[PDB]
Amino acid sequence: EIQFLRTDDEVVLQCTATIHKEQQKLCLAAEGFGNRLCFLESTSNSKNVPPDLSICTFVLEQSLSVRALQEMLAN
Numbered sequence: 527e528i529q530f531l532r533t534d535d536e537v538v539l540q541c542t543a544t545i546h547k548e549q550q551k552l553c554l555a556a557e558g559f560g561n562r563l564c565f566l567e568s569t570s571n572s573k574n575v576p577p578d579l580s581i582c583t584f585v586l587e588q589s590l591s592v593r594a595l596q597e598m599l600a601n
Contacts, residue, residue, distance in 0.1 A: 533589050538582045540569065555582040 531537065543550035551570035555578065556562070569577040590598065 531586065533586050536583050536585050538579065539584070541566075553577065553579070553582045557581055 539554040541552055541554070543552055549570070550568060552566040552568050554564055555567040556564040558581075567577050567579075567582055568575070569579075
């Protein structure tokens with residue numbers, strides 16, 4: 527009944543802002559071409575300004591354990 531985040535699923539990372547006693551919802555965005563630095567795209571003001579979700583989505587490839595990751599990195 528409750529869905530589980532599984533690998534190969536496309537997701538967006540959202541964080542909440544409490545600036546000046548206002549709940550602002552922001553997503554983690556990055557433009558791979560050009561500036562590699564990540565920035566935030568606001569999604570709480572979708573009524574006034576459309577969010578650019580095209581560059582805020584990530585795909586979860588692997589969910590290896592810590593020990594399995596260490597063995598990966600050793601080998």
